[PDB]
From a paper:
[name] [name] ([name]), a prokaryotic model of pLGICs, is particularly well-suited to stabilize preactive states under suboptimal activating conditions modulated by pH. The [name] homomer consists of five subunits, each with an ECD and TMD. [name] is activated by the protonation of a series of titratable residues in the ECD, leading to counterclockwise rotation and contraction of the ECD. Therefore, we established a data processing strategy involving symmetry expansion, backtracking particles, supervised particle reorientation, and 3D reconstruction to resolve high-resolution maps of various asymmetric intermediate states of nanodisc-reconstituted [name] at pH 4.0, which provide comprehensive understanding of activation mechanism of [name].
Residue numbers in the entry:
A (entry chain A), B (entry chain B), C (entry chain C), D (entry chain E), E (entry chain D): 5 to 316
The structure:
């Protein structure tokens, strides 16, 4: 069929709305995430009678091949959405109700700085196709936009899901300048990360730090170097549960600082043994007593400085 | 071919039924699982008879393009099901028997607390589109629902497969539609996990604990640190089996407690050596004799408390 | 078109034959594999015949849509096969020759309880739809059953490919159906497993057993714990290819026994050192001399018992 | 629906242009990258010239069918592009307007002689085969060639996206064809590779070097060999990413040099101990004092020479 | 439509030809690779011929569904090729041209008997069925077989791409078929393997060999066991990318020999210590002095013998 003819020079406003259901498969290396959700639309279609009569006040059912369906394309999807219509219901005289379920691989930026304690925003951009009838503009209705409060997004909690009309700036053609933006606010749950990552590494570092209460060079060497090996193994373990991020990160800075501390500890042990052999035991004892207090305080101050630098 | 016309405004009850064939590929990171099964509806027609002659008592077999096949849609599937019709034989009495086969990827939430001893319940939802003549009521046929007793899911044993009628309760009550829920209770076989994971860790921990019968500081340091390295390697080895779970788990708590015990053992060894060097062998011996009984009892009590907290 | 007339009171026999072309991608975790083969059919239809008067060629071609073709459905397949009809020929007496070429992926159980030295059997099931007029039965033609010489599975050698000519009839959903069974026996090529897996483990164990010829406590501790670390590392190489079976296996039993032996060796070393420190060297010497012979004999007997248990 | 007739012998020209949207999934081992963009075309056909003087005022508009759209294909793609048409329009004189959106995966070789600090160039080739009755040649419309401001690649900086105006015509398969070239120049962001890789290995090497201030043989052996093990683990972690090339890169040369330095350090330690045992301590002291200064200077000189060779 | 008339004495002969565009993704464990190429056909049809008079100068250009096109299939492919027709032309005498571009995945065995320095041959098989009226055979058009200059494989270099002109005619399921063989010979780029695998192994072995110049039991144990631990990781790395074979390769034999050497070294160290403790130092000195020369010579001879056995 064909879209309705113009009635009174009033543009055909399409009241769009996304009813999110599922979010999963957040592949971070390619920065893609699949979405399973509904899509509700309503375009006022007066002057095209669809059984308007009091005796026929019943709700009429229409199929996909019954009325003109506006064509809306997602901008940032790898392929066209695989959409199946759930139902189409039209009032005897008034608007039209539409609902369909689709799946699509969406591409949105995913910042990973301050990774354990970060928030993310997901964007879906919508555009409409103008046809032989009057010009079509896009508007959002707040009655249909929302979730079912049973979203199966694990590891994150949804804070808001809103929309706003924004201009479209890409290959402008005096048209198609009424794109839509949908923002999904999510926040990572950071509780399990503490016992899973942070505490064991601190335990390993504190085990390495016990060499300042000993004077046995072999024992100190074994302690520090085997603790470094254990740290490398734990870094291998951690690296798996984390996407490949070719940029600086809070966790990477912490790891680098840990490596630096290991190097400084090795230097201190070597200096102490060298002085003891060269027969300056008072100087060696002074150095080790100073180190016992110096190391944790410097570690804590560096942690505070780095946290302030990264988290405003 | 159209849906049957109404007779006396009696709603038509469709006796649905799902017969499982294959269940496989229970992926937990994506929180999905593919299923291959049957589908049967027992809707009957009254006005539109199908050769109801006594002489032609032979069962009439029809192609899909011979009658009206109801459109049933699954709420929580990624894509539309592949409808592979099996057989459509309609008796001249009036009732219709239908069979088909589909292979759809189902989305269902999973819980991985008490991971080695966990049980899961998988859900399948159904919906039917109302027609403009009258309303279609969804019902459950008890005989049709069942399995073939050769459904093979690796690592799980299937217990029951039942169906109930529940209200839709969706925020988009287009037609006050109904819904169906199919539940598949399963359990995990946990016996192999004991020899595969639990016992080697206990052996490694006891090997670590053998340092309380020795006085050689270098030997004790080597034992404890190499045992810690072995524990880290075993954790890397066993990380490949657990799903990537963004919340706390019984096994994770056990591993964290093991790390804490290693740290405490290192501290105890350091204290013993420091006392011996400071020439307090009585205190050193008292502490090292106390530890031999202190460590296993505290470990057992912590295990009991953790088990009670996680399993009620 | 309509099925052949039921004037022939005897059941309509449909000869069947599957000729393999290649087999590939034998999956272990999902226990599925993909196939590519011909599908032959043959039956007699007196409704359409040929005469030499029309032509002396004695062979008549046809189109799939102009001839009643029985419908054959696979049972244990993830999706529908991709059928490619080749040619249809009609004998002058009414014998029809049908041919196709398909590809599909088959679901079949696997049993890795003798993993290095196990054998498997892959099944393909065929069913035929009943018809109102006549009765349909399935038969097996041995001359149409075979396999190419270029069929190969990476790591397996094919023994035989036969078909059970005995259908297992059953009544499902008030309908009678017939089934066929095609069996493909395979065996795993285990020769490479010996020098790649078994012998290095024996070498490492024999290296660790050398601690019974020395009295230096530190050297014994280093030997035993470092060999334990090496065993843990080698287990990763072993598990990088072994399928994740959630049940008991011969290899898992061997590995668990190895862990137990390591624990017992650590215990023996600790006991010897403790006895030597308390100025009782004769008992320590007796213990180590006894262990030197005790360990290999017990290991051999346990290996024999396990081999008898899992292969008897 | 048919090639336009030439006046006497003139060929036909089509003006193209690609507007990027986003680039992602740039593989290093596979040497492939994905893309999705807009494709614009324009060509002149005087057979369907519009006449606004008498027959209508508005210019012609069409649909994806019932109009000839020339065959435009990509040479270096794995599969045919997935495209959907967005707009078609026809000018009164005869020139046509076309637009579509596509997504494809492109094959292009990469050069890793300067892997941490390298820049690449990606090629996209278009082509069209001349039909019998009318040769076709391509052209570039600079007003349409460009990239979106949101075009971002993870870890790369985009510098330019231009097209070579001159086509490369050649006779292939007894037909004349024309080819366009699109070039995308990018540069890697190298900062994050410094603290993640470069510095930890230097720290480990210095920890290894620290053994020249010691005279205990066991401590030196422990230091050097454990640092070698740590280097091996780090090298495996690094090599998990970079692919293998027929030529020699920079990182591989650095790693090989580090291995050589470790071997020489082990040799020096063994020589020092052997000389000390034979009661010649002065030579051992001279050798170790020489090595203390010899090693870092040679390391620095070799690094400078490698930097000059690879980047000069 | 219809097969060409068998008025000509010879059977129907089709001239084929494949022109490679690019090859990629040569999987090693699955023994597969992907291809993108053209496909040209040519045969003789007595009908459809036309006279250059009556506008017959224009050579006819039909489309599929208007002529009889022979069915040609690839034997060793996982799925049917994704093909699109390019152009069909008919010469006035009666010969028919044909062109088509496709992409497919090919199955072909490999031979890793000389894995680092091996050469492979890849096969693509074309087959054709037979029709009732006439018989069909294949041929090779020499001037239509070739490859682009941009055909590159990652890790290999392409030598030649020819075709065996002699078909293999045989009867398969009561019909005669003809087959063609296309061979692609490639050689491996082995330069990257030497400085990444071979030399570090030799360095580690030489480092472990330094225990023959020492007399301290603990240092020797540490050296040998830590070198074995380092060797195991390289074994894992090498075995990751090399599949399992029923025969014995070169690298596996080298690795097994290295394991044997490590075991013998451990035995020698233990024997030396046992003799030294027993107050027999001269015999131990003789043993270690003999071993110093014995080990490298035996290693060199064994390497030479293995190289002669596998490559000669
Ligand atoms: C030194 C620091 C030791 C105390 C640190 C405790 C921090 C919390 C922690 O790691 O807990 C892990 C774990 C239990 O976690 P739950 O709180 O039961 O998790 C379920 C509820 N979310 O702690 C233990 O098992 C403690 C063992 C003693
Ligand atoms: C954070 C940095 C942690 C570094 C590692 C801690 C090492 C502690 C060793 C202290 C030690 O040996 O002291 C022995 C000392 C000697 O006794 P006198 O008072 O002289 O009689 O005895 C003690 O202090 C008894 C032990 C008390 C507990 C020691 C550890 C407590 C802190 C643990 C870390 C918490 C985080
Ligand atoms: C010497 C005796 C060795 C007996 C070994 C028996 C054996 O291997 O049985 C394994 C068997 C099941 O077979 P798998 O295939 O491993 O099943 C799980 C999948 N991996 O597992 C078990 O036995 C389960 C564990 C229960 C028994 C545990 C025995 C513990 C013994 C402790 C001895 C301590 C010695 C102290 C000396 C003082
Ligand atoms: C569980 C925790 C296990 C930690 C390790 C326990 C074994 C330490 C070694 C004990 C030791 O040296 O005892 C020597 C002691 C000396 O006897 P006198 O009184 O001097 O005569 O002899 C013995 O105890 C004999 C050997 C028995 C050791 C086996 C004990 C069982 C250990 C594993 C239990 C199962 C888990
Ligand atoms: C140790 C100190 C920290 C490591 C050195 C920091 C390197 C950053 C230097 C800037 C590199 C980029 C740049 O603009 O330099 C120019 C140039 C690249 O530009 P094109 O020639 O176009 O390519 O870069 C170079 O030549 C840099 C190469 C030498 C310096 C980097 C070497 C660092 C690692 C080697 C030493 C340690 C061994 C491990
Ligand atoms: C790049 C560097 C690569 C090599 C690094 C090896 C480690 C540095 C040397 C550690 C031991 C130095 C040492 O023993 O010096 C002690 C020596 C003793 O004093 P005298 O009275 O002269 O005797 O000097 C000191 O105490 C000075 C302090 C030494 C540490 C400062 C140097 C740190 C180097 C970082 C690089
Ligand atoms: C490659 C084959 C296997 C190599 C194993 C590693 C080689 C170890 C060599 C150690 C040499 C050693 O300890 O002896 C040093 C010995 C010192 O003894 P002198 O008193 O000078 O004369 C001997 C009579 N008293 O001689 C030397 O200093 C020679 C220098 C050793 C260079 C070794 C180079 C090895 C290169 C391998 C490639
Ligand atoms: C098969 C089971 C293998 C069990 C594990 C074996 C552990 C290693 C064997 C012991 C090595 C040390 C032997 C030793 O020190 O022998 C001393 C002994 C001293 O002799 P007398 O002074 O007369 O007494 O030295 C010798 O001459 C013994 C010869 C030993 C070398 C040959 C060893 C062969 C081992 C084969 C292991 C199985 C394959
Ligand atoms: C000293 C300790 C060992 C260090 C060196 C270990 C590695 C040695 C490997 C030698 C090697 O690969 O030689 C193989 C190589 C090839 O053998 P073919 O099979 O005949 O060649 C193929 C063409 N027909 O053999 C030779 O070239 C032998 C020539 C003498 C080698 C050096 C002897 C001195
Ligand atoms: Cl879309
Ligand atoms: Cl569905
Ligand atoms: Cl099927
Ligand atoms: Cl294309
Ligand atoms: Cl094909």
């Amino acid at each position: 069929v064909s879209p309705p003819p113009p009635i009174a020079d009033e543009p055909l406003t399409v009241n769009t709305g996304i009813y999110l259901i599922e979010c999963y498969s957040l592949d971070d290396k390619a920065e893609t995430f699949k979405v399973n959700a509904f899509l509700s639309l309503s375009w006022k279609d007066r002057r095209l009678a669809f059984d308007p009569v009091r005796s026929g006040v019943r709700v009429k059912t229409y199929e996909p091949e019954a009325i003109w369906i506006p064509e809306i394309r997602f901008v940032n999807v790898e392929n066209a959405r695989d959409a199946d219509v759930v139902d189409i219901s039209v009032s005897p005289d008034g608007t039209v109700q539409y609902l369909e379920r689709f799946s699509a691989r969406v591409l949105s930026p995913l910042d990973f700085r301050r990774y354990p304690f970060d928030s993310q925003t997901l964007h879906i951009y919508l555009i409409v196709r103008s046809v032989d009838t009057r010009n079509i503009v896009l508007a959002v209705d707040l009655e249909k936009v929302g979730k079912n409060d049973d979203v199966f997004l694990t590891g994150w909690d949804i804070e808001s899901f809103t929309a706003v009309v924004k201009p479209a700036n890409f290959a402008l053609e005096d048209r198609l300048e009424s794109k839509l933006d949908y923002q999904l606010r999510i926040s990572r749950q950071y509780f399990s990360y503490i016992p899973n990552i942070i505490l064991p590494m601190l335990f390993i570092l504190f085990i390495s730090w016990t060499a300042f209460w000993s004077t046995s060079y072999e024992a100190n060497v074994t302690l520090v170097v085997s603790t470094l090996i254990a740290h490398i193994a734990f870094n291998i373990l951690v690296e798996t549960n984390l996407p490949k991020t070719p940029y600086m990160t809070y966790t990477g800075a912490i790891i680098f600082m840990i490596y630096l501390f290991y190097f400084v500890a090795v230097i201190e042990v070597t200096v102490q043994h060298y002085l003891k052999v060269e027969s300056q035991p008072a100087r060696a004892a002074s150095i080790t007593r100073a180190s016992r207090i110096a190391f944790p305080v410097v570690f804590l101050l560096a942690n505070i400085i780095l946290a302030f630098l990264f988290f405003g």
